[PDB]
Design a protein around this nucleic acid. Structure first.
Length: 175
RNA sequence: AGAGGAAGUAGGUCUCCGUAGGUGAACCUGCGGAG
């Protein structure tokens, strides 16, 4: 018998107050969004450390900016990963014109560039300033990560999107 | 002004917060900030 408690940011508290993991994995839950904690407890119907760690990963992935439409995908498919890239990781210049210009390049007006990158490499990303979070299979996470870091190296989004599309097609192909 | 003669050229998304107005709890728009 093991328990795991996770902290949540003060962003998604109403969305966590929305309504089930006891039905999903037979693992008893408690919540308190004023101490920012969510208790996960394993019962006699709870069988595996896989179920424990996957419930923990599902709740933390809902906490870090994804909704349930992209979180029950993590509850369901075991090939699905999350990777959280800080924009402060590997940096091309020392100059502090970073945050606004970089996430203006990555996000794009009305979400055009983030959305086209998502549709191109089949991954699902969310963007909040310094931290950008990628969800999907880890080769798609590698594709989205190399596209985003080539966006912050200062390459144009048209050329980056073209190369991303051709790499995504060659990765979809079997032989 | 005249019929002839002869010639030549052809780039801030999402979420939250503080605002100000709107039709009020909520909610919408605009702005200023943090993730």
């Amino acid at each position: 018998i093991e328990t795991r408690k996770i902290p949540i940011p003060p962003h998604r508290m109403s969305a966590l107050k929305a309504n089930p993991l006891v039905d999903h994995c037979k693992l008893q839950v408690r919540m308190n969004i004023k101490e920012k904690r969510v208790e996960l407890r394993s019962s006699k119907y709870t069988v595996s450390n896989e179920a424990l760690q996957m419930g923990a990963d599902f709740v933390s992935a809902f906490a870090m900016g994804f909704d349930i439409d992209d979180a029950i995908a993590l509850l369901r498919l075991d090939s699905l990963y999350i990777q959280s890239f800080d924009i402060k990781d590997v940096r091309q210049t020392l100059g502090p014109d970073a945050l606004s210009r970089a996430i203006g390049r990555i996000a794009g007006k009305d979400g055009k560039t983030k959305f086209a990158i998502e549709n191109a490499t089949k991954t699902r990303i969310v963007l909040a300033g310094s931290k950008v979070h990628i969800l999907g299979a880890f080769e798609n996470i590698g594709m989205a990560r190399e596209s985003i870091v080539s966006l912050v190296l200062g390459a144009q989004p048209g050329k980056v999107y073209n190369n991303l599309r051709i790499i995504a097609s060659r990765m979809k192909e079997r032989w």
